[PDB]
Amino acid sequence: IEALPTHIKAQVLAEALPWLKQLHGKVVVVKYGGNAMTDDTLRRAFAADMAFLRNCGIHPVVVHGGGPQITAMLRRLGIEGDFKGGFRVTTPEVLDVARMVLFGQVGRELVNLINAHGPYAVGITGEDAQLFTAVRRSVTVDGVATDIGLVGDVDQVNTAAMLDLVAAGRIPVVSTLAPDADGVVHNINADTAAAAVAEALGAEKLLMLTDIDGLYTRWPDRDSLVSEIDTGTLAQLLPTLESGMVPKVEACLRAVIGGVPSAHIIDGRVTHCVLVELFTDAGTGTKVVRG
Amino acid sequence: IEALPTHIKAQVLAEALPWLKQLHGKVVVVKYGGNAMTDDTLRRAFAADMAFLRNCGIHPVVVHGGGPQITAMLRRLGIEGDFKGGFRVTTPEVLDVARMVLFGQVGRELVNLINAHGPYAVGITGEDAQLFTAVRRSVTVDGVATDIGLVGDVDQVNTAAMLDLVAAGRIPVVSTLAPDADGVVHNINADTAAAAVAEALGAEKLLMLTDIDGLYTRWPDRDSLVSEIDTGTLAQLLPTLESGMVPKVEACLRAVIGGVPSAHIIDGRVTHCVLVELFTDAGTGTKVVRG
Amino acid sequence: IEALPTHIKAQVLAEALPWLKQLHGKVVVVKYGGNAMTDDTLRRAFAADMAFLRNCGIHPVVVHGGGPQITAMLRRLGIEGDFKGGFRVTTPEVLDVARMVLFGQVGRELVNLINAHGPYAVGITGEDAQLFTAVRRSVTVDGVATDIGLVGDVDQVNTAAMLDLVAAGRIPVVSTLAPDADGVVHNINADTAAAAVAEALGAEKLLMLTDIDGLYTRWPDRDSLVSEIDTGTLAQLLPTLESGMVPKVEACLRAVIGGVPSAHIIDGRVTHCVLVELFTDAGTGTKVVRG
Amino acid sequence: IEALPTHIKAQVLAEALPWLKQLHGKVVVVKYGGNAMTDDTLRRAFAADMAFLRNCGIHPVVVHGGGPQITAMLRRLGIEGDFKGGFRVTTPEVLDVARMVLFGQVGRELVNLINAHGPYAVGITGEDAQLFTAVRRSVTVDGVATDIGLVGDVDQVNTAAMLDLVAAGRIPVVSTLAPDADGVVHNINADTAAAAVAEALGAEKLLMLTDIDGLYTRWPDRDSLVSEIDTGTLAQLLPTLESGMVPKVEACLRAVIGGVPSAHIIDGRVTHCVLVELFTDAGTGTKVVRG
Amino acid sequence: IEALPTHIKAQVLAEALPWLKQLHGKVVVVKYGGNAMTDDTLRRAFAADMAFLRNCGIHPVVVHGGGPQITAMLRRLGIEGDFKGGFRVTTPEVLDVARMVLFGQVGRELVNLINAHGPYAVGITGEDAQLFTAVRRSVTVDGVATDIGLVGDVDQVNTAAMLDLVAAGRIPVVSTLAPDADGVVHNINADTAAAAVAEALGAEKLLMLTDIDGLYTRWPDRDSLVSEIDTGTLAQLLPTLESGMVPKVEACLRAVIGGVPSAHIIDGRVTHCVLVELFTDAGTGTKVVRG
Amino acid sequence: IEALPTHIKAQVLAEALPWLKQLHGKVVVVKYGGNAMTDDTLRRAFAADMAFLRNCGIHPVVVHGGGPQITAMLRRLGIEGDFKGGFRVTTPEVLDVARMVLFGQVGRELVNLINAHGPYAVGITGEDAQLFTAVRRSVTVDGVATDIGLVGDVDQVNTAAMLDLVAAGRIPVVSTLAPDADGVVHNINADTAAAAVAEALGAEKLLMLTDIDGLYTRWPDRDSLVSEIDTGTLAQLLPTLESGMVPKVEACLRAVIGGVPSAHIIDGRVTHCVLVELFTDAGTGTKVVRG
Ligand SMILES: c1ccc(-c2ncc[nH]2)cc1
Numbered sequence A, B, C, D, E, F: 001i002e003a004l005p006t007h008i009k010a011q012v013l014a015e016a017l018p019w020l021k022q023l024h025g026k027v028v029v030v031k032y033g034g035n036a037m038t039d040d041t042l043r044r045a046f047a048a049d050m051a052f053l054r055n056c057g058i059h060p061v062v063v064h065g066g067g068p069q070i071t072a073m074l075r076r077l078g079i080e081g082d083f084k085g086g087f088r089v090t091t092p093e094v095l096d097v098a099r100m101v102l103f104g105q106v107g108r109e110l111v112n113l114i115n116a117h118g119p120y121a122v123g124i125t126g127e128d129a130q131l132f133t134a135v136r137r138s139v140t141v142d143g144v145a146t147d148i149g150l151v152g153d154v155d156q157v158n159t160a161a162m163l164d165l166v167a168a169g170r171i172p173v174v175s176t177l178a179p180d181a182d183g184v185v186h187n188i189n190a191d192t193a194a195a196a197v198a199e200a201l202g203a204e205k206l207l208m209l210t211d212i213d214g215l216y217t218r219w220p221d222r223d224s225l226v227s228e229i230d231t232g233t234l235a236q237l238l239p240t241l242e243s244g245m246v247p248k249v250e251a252c253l254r255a256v257i258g259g260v261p262s263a264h265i266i267d268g269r270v271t272h273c274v275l276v277e278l279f280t281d282a283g284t285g286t287k288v289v290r291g
């Protein structure tokens, strides 16, 4: 990167200015998962980018999942799964493992990576200071809503206390578990939780890291890939798309309809994808606006 | 408790006044472990008592261990131990399990129990916001200091940030793990960590829950049990006492010599032992002062 | 109180927890008069209990009367009274004596008693910083409203400035005198003033110390004594009750209808009655709620 | 005052500017007594002048005595005096009367007069919030120090809390009584108390209202009257002067030696003497500086 | 001024009290121009009077013009004028000169004069921190609205930021130039700008220094001079008055109709006219109220 | 700049991270002059870069000169110069022109350019709020110190008030004129003033824009150009260098010896030179450190 002239280095930095002004002093919620968390180089770049935002006076909030790591831990403990549809039932035993893995392993890695740059990261669940609650959720198998145990959706969010946390200079790293109204802790889909937190905090942007170039309207036609779409056109395309793209689109719909100015599905396989998406126009990924 | 006259109920409450004045607005660090954490009734009373302190304008800070639960989890994962002396070596693999169990299971139980009374508890490690660091520690087997892996002592404590946390009304629940100066996370003895935190925060008292009536100078002579002792007399008795009483005495010595006005070894098998020790004169347990 | 087991001492303290949470950070207005102010032991217990509340982060506000002491001082000065009905006319001369006795003697005793526990008590009248005003009040003798001089009801209260005072850690001790809109100072019934202050400050509770076990619906039938009553049922019983119980009931009605969640008529002859009423279920006295 | 040209009105106001700059944001302690408090016109002008200072962003603090009113009240109550030298012994009974008269009558008049201009005045004793303490003082009769009861000198002053009070916009009106270290309330000479408060608060000026034109070095030679004197020359003149001028000079000496930049003995018989002394060069009275 | 008795000096100062209370903590906007800025003695008195207000806790805001100095500078630079009606066209070149003269010379004199009394004055334009904007304005020559270049009216005012500035103890000295919505800086009539700033800041008074005794309803009849007039009667008199009195009346109308309690046209040829108008009843000049 | 791959765009932004952390929350003083202020594209890039710093939570402070523009204005006004050595004497007349040009024209351009990005820029001189003073300075012609009029060096700086200004989000644009201790305004060399302000404010960096690639030790040998030098080696080279490079080196010496961690002489002819110098390693220009 040294054989590149200094006056092009300048222009690249200068073209970040409009996006620095747009985001200065604002909340950005970043759903972190997939490859951007398994490969060590992408991991470290992601942590650097959270430090970047913080050292620009931007307020990042990280929401993470960890489905596969839960599965691996359950197999290691020899805990036999019950499955309704393609859903593991979340017994009290499974919840304990999920919470232990998400908060006690997956979140800790990200906190330590970010904290390599300063005392920024703080790990939290809805349990801590009652920062958010859950409501138990059923799923539809074939065409019947069924109980798959202690799994929920985000209910209420302590918006004031969360924004106190970021105004102090902290980067919350959220593991998505929270008590219901009776104190019973549920596991929440990280994609959904990210949308709910962005709406509650009044985020300026929601970023969704996934392992795709962007949204394809007619996958796999290479030139069905769009770079911007309104929630109006996006919702009528939802019943079309691949199984795994559904939760990331529903999150973008709910956030942007909820008042978040834009949500973005970006390529987690790209190093520093957050920097590219936020401070560059030539980014991959697709932006969702209301319409 | 209803067949007891109301005018004796009054006197019991009135006699708490001097101790309410002594502790109002002050930090109290409470090492929580042993039976007071395995039995469900003592557990819930302990959480109620932390809520009690908080609703008196007192600032409790909870430090917890969980040695046996780590051991159980390692056996379940089939992770074979290496032992030098009677010490398990803490490999990177063992540290991950310890951190996951301490922060992701043991601490979560206490956070949820306390939070049954309000949005008070917040779970933290030295990793979070770089609140404290560790320095790797060796142990003496027979008469040689030996490496038992990623185990340490508390190094530095971010006193300002910790006191910000409690002045906001939060009750930190601390899992004793922290990075060394290179970012490598170590496991810290909870008894020692409690003493270090009490000294760094300028605590008014350190409470050490154990499964004993109190300190016996000549165990097991029943009337060698003392209720107050100076650090001068206590340190010369240290090489006498039982193996498990050593870490709780060393903590009291280091805290009280470090400027903490008094440290207390109290009976964790007694329901509401914290309330009895703090707001009553007829408590069991032994108070350590400087001398 | 030492021959009583420690585990019952614990339960008594633990059962205060719900009431500590209910009152933490809240205003409590306490009308102090009768025997709880003439006997030296009850006096000192009352002052201790105000210190108790303050060292729990509760915000007590004390309103006091002193009818008999005014009368004694007037007789000592040989000031001849004029009486309409059973009411002394409050001439400018009588007002001066009342103000001097209430603010310069009765209030000072309570300020010094409370201040034996710390720098808490501050003596105030509506005159000070214009904290509240009075409106001149007439009384009905037989069936004609008559002028009995410089006696009034509380008019407006400087709510903001009063709450500044308590948030600073002060326990106001209020002598009930205040200027009217023309600067002319009136004497206000302490029972009525206590109700008005509780409503203006948004108090969580109003406590009325009197020399009775509680409200008897059919005095003197021993088992007409109630421990809770709605303002609806209480107001229709008002024209029944004894002369001296009237002002304490009217105060409770006006406070609780005014939005104060509960008012309490409690037994001032009981040592630490405030502690018993607030932090115990087995208290005497009767609670007034809206209904 | 209307037949005087407007351009001389202007110059009088303009010449106040240097003294407005000197005093803006500063504490001024004013000892108020003598004729400036018995005549109703001088009274009301004094209260107006305290309002004046407050509406210039100056911080007045009023200290008052009331020797004669105590005497009158004692005669009315038929309380027989004991006299050592020319000093009444202050029994507990006499103290109660003094406190009641000073705080409950004399101070209230001044609070209401000042408060005619706004919510400024607040009445205080050392009893309130432990704002200052007393130490019991003996007096020398002929040549023996003798106990004249519950009379003292100011001991310690809660400087922080007093300055909080004035920064809130309040004008403290101080009645000079305060507890000793055992809680026993003493009466303090108002002249002495004024000097002690000025030194503790770091006052810019101490004003001493008396019924004299100023300090005469050789009374009654009319042209021995000085308008400025150093503490050096003033202390060697102290054993010369009239009995009643002694306490006002000792106060000025102790304040100015204590670091108060200047103390002033001014003519309380002059209407608006405070305004003339502070904002005019052609004032009567004598200024004391260190030297 | 020394041969005038001290007790009349007192009364002059005492009669300022009602006006000190009315203005304490309030904004006063002062349009400064005409003779009060060309003569050196009136200049220095005006600066002293701004210091006076500031050392009373009043918040002065100074708006200045400088028409003649612009003209002189343009002649010195040999810049030829274009005139439509009697209006110079404000080309970009003329604007640069106007801005340079107003902000770089006329304002600096006033800042340094005021600052002779302390660190009070700060020079500002609408350009600084975007404190206010302009909208380009046309003028009517004969009966056609015509473009006279870069001249405007005040558009929006950053009220919050302006009041931050004065609460910090600063006396803004405003040169009336401001950018339009496209960043193009316009020159604004100082009389009009003063009215707009007073309304935006919620000023208690607007003062307009002019070289007249006051408003004459039938100039030049000597006894058509009024000392108070309602906006109702004043607006119907506007089409009558002299050319140069028009802008000062329109400003008073717009301010007082805009909610400013009173606007005043006062005699700038009188030394300390501001002091006389604000703190005296025997001032010249005419007060405008709504009606 | 669009034909350049996105993954190199990323790396350029990512490599700014260490410098964002170094400067976040810190003061940077930027001396702005030469070509970076005459060409319109470099001008606008410089203003963008000040906005850049501000939208990263960095605190830029701009100091500007304008020697040539003063000269041009003096010629236009036909003001004849007196010259001692090669120095124009600064008569009161010349000072007025200099102040008018620097504050009323040169500074206004920069304020409006910066403010195109937001309400950031505020123009100030040492005159405003007494933010800094000057001391009159003589110069050595041949070998005699001579009076060249109202030219000075920065004397004292109101550090507290200046940092209040930047913490509010303002970017001061400083025109270097200030009063001496007698209120007489002097013109200060902008290079020297920049060094003094950086030292007084505790700046993290001083940037000196000049029209050179960097410091040549043996000009004009092309490979005598250094990119870093200690103050020790730099001071012994000072008597060697070109006339115009002297003031920029003396400033760097005085700032860096004064405790400013590094001063930089950078190429003002390079677009976005500030961005390149601060957030890139491949910048031109030379860094001065202490040694
Ligand atoms: C440091 C600072 C804040 C926190 C925290 N966690 C939840 C709420 N606050 C944890 C550590």
Ligand SMILES: c1ccc(-c2ncc[nH]2)cc1
Binding pocket: C122, C123, C124, C128, C129, C165, C170, D122, D123, D124, D128, D129, D165
């Ligand atoms: C100490 C602190 C506050 C007060 C007070 N009294 C009325 C308002 N504020 C009096 C003493």
Ligand SMILES: c1ccc(-c2ncc[nH]2)cc1
Binding pocket: E122, E123, E124, E128, E129, E165, E170, F122, F123, F124, F128, F129, F165
């Ligand atoms: C000192 C303090 C404040 C200012 C200022 N000017 C515009 C906004 N703030 C200028 C100097």
